[PDB]
Amino acid sequence: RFLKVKNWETDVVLTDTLHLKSTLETGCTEHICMGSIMLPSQHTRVATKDQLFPLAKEFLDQYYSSIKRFGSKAHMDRLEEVNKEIESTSTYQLKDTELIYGAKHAWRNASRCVGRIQWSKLQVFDARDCTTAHGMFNYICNHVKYATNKGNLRSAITIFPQRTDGKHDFRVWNSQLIRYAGYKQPDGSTLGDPANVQFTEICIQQGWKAPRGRFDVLPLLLQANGNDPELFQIPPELVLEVPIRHPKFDWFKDLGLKWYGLPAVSNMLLEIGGLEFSACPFSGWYMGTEIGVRDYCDNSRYNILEEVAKKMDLDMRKTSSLWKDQALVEINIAVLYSFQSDKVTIVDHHSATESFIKHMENEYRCRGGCPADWVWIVPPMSGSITPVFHQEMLNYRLTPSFEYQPDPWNTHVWKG
Ligand code: HEM
Ligand SMILES: CNCc1cc(Cl)cc(-c2cc(C)cc(N)n2)c1
Ligand SMILES: C[C@H](O)[C@H](O)[C@H]1CNc2nc(N)[nH]c(=O)c2N1
Ligand SMILES: [Zn+2]
């Protein structure tokens, strides 16, 4: 009841007691392990007033235990106050302090996030007074400008009104605030980002005038209080982009690649004391490999291993010439170098995974554990030459948390 996780590179052992506070379920049983199911039946998100208070109490007890005013009068009164409000209003409202705590700790608990060493340094923007898609557009624009900080990227989250009935729902329909468009071609192939081809088609179905190109930043599709979503284009001066060059291969610039500096996930759901925030875009900075390995070299994404290995002049006839590997490394050297030379914040997969081991040590010390999803923490290249490969990690689900949620167009009772 006090499990141990070993690092097999360093022979370090850490004792995990935090998993005992775990509440949610993982998907695994004693007879089957789902650790590699991407969106397990559990990881996806209507409530009742009865369910709501234990979740509120449980959350409030750890918040007051975090300011070391656990069980005091200030705590018991807040327990009573929210109990009463879940009677009166069948729900409740977080204090600003509670919102900032819960949001930080949802990140802290994000077992698939390798960046969490920064969890306490998160800027929380309270958009709970927002009422229109135009207001969402405004809060998001302030979020982009703030979190971008002229390339000195800063972690932030903007938290729109919580779900109430369900049919009134604030949603950012974009999967991220800044993403490149995907256009299928008349010959079947794909321009831009193939991930977003369906989303790009939705934006055009709502009137987007597509500049049918590669790195065309998509418009925000913002749904406010259940109403139909509306298009807004982020002021281009607010979307910071890094042109990708290589520090040796001067032909690399002719590849004509770029990426945006701000990774800002917008499709997920924040849970805080039973309250559900369906629109809560959050940003940090990139680990290089998300761009250089996944964005650029996934077969179903940009898929540039072909053209890079070409210009490198590589033994491409044979699978075993590791021409794909050799061109994957150059691509990631180039992403890193380009971002660093523009002073745009980026972390390489070695520095990031080291920070996470350090972060794990702190979490087992001053917290008793650190839920971690090996399948997601190990970078998608050079796995075993990074220290997280060698670190046993216990995955368990704690709250507050970020959850997945259905895409809004599969669930929105639309009315033209
Ligand atoms: C500050 C720098 C950050 C870095 C370097 C970082 C790094 C990463 C990476 C590489 C992933 C894997 C994504 C993929 O490869 O598909 C990830 C996932 C994730 N990040 Fe972090 N992140 C950062 C900040 C944040 C912030 C500020 C939040 C929330 C406020 C957050 C929440 C999450 C969540 C919830 C996931 C996983 C989603 C899931 O469960 O599937 N991250 N992060
Ligand atoms: C392949 N990248 C796609 C992707 C997917 C997801 Cl679920 C999260 C992030 C993400 C989010 C934040 C806040 C920082 C960061 N470095 N990455 C990126
Ligand atoms: C099938 C598998 O679960 C899926 O490819 C996961 C594996 N690990 C991952 N790890 C990260 N960081 N990001 C991902 O998208 C994935 N994809
Ligand atoms: Zn398992």
Side-chain angles (χ1 to χ4, degrees), residues 266-284:
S266 52
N267 62 351
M268 288 184 82
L269 200 157
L270 166 60
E271 264 201 28
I272 299 176
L275 300 177
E276 299 192 325
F277 297 97
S278 52
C280 52
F282 54 86
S283 61

Side-chain angles (χ1 to χ4, degrees), residues 176 263 265 268 282-287 290 294-295 376 404:
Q176 315 169 18
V265 164
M268 288 184 82
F282 54 86
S283 61
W285 48 84
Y286 265 113
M287 194 171 64
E290 303 171 78
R294 308 303 305 295
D295 289 331
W376 275 63
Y404 279 108

Side-chain angles (χ1 to χ4, degrees), residues 6-58:
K6 182 173 176 185
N7 186 296
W8 295 92
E9 195 200 312
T10 56
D11 278 283
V12 170
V13 178
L14 291 150
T15 306
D16 194 297
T17 27
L18 180 64
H19 75 285
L20 297 172
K21 306 297 247 294
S22 169
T23 160
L24 272 148
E25 293 187 32
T26 65
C28 310
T29 58
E30 305 91 291
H31 313 99
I32 184 160
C33 171
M34 312 270 178
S36 66
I37 302 302
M38 168 107 78
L39 319 164
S41 176
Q42 271 74 341
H43 208 344
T44 307
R45 284 328 191 197
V46 47
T48 74
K49 43 179 186 178
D50 4 346
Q51 301 151 332
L52 240 77
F53 188 72
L55 300 165
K57 175 181 214 316
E58 166 194 349

Side-chain angles (χ1 to χ4, degrees), residues 373-386:
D373 188 332
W374 198 101
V375 164
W376 275 63
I377 295 291
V378 177
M381 68 182 307
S382 314
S384 56
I385 71 164
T386 72

Side-chain angles (χ1 to χ4, degrees), residues 17-217:
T17 27
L18 180 64
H19 75 285
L20 297 172
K21 306 297 247 294
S22 169
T23 160
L24 272 148
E25 293 187 32
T26 65
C28 310
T29 58
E30 305 91 291
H31 313 99
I32 184 160
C33 171
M34 312 270 178
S36 66
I37 302 302
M38 168 107 78
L39 319 164
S41 176
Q42 271 74 341
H43 208 344
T44 307
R45 284 328 191 197
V46 47
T48 74
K49 43 179 186 178
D50 4 346
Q51 301 151 332
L52 240 77
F53 188 72
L55 300 165
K57 175 181 214 316
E58 166 194 349
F59 170 74
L60 291 180
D61 278 274
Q62 63 199 246
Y63 168 59
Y64 278 101
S65 184
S66 87
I67 58 193
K68 267 63 184 181
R69 295 131 111 277
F70 173 31
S72 66
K73 185 98 168 66
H75 176 195
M76 291 301 123
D77 266 316
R78 180 97 192 97
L79 217 62
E80 176 97 345
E81 182 177 46
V82 167
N83 197 45
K84 292 168 158 162
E85 186 181 1
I86 300 179
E87 307 278 356
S88 159
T89 81
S90 60
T91 175
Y92 73 96
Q93 297 296 321
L94 295 166
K95 293 279 163 218
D96 283 24
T97 53
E98 289 159 4
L99 189 84
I100 302 160
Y101 172 97
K104 281 174 187 201
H105 276 78
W107 183 11
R108 195 183 189 179
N109 293 337
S111 64
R112 299 187 158 172
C113 174
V114 79
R116 288 179 276 165
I117 199 221
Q118 284 274 18
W119 74 267
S120 75
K121 297 206 69 251
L122 173 70
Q123 182 51 48
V124 186
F125 292 110
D126 182 352
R128 283 178 300 163
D129 54 308
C130 188
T131 64
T132 55
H134 279 73
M136 296 171 70
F137 170 65
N138 195 63
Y139 271 111
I140 293 174
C141 275
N142 287 355
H143 177 137
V144 174
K145 200 175 198 173
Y146 176 88
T148 298
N149 189 29
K150 313 199 324 298
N152 179 24
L153 274 36
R154 301 185 288 202
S155 311
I157 185 173
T158 297
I159 295 161
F160 288 105
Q162 65 211 33
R163 177 183 279 116
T164 49
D165 72 320
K167 201 45 241 165
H168 304 107
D169 249 41
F170 288 75
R171 295 290 315 273
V172 187
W173 283 33
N174 302 63
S175 24
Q176 315 169 18
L177 306 180
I178 294 164
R179 287 209 85 169
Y180 295 132
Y183 318 90
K184 36 170 78 161
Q185 289 296 76
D187 52 296
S189 49
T190 298
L191 183 50
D193 197 336
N196 308 309
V197 177
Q198 210 230 39
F199 180 77
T200 297
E201 191 55 37
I202 289 161
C203 295
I204 308 175
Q205 279 253 337
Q206 302 293 273
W208 192 51
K209 301 278 92 196
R212 193 126 343 206
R214 212 101 147 103
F215 311 109
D216 310 353
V217 191

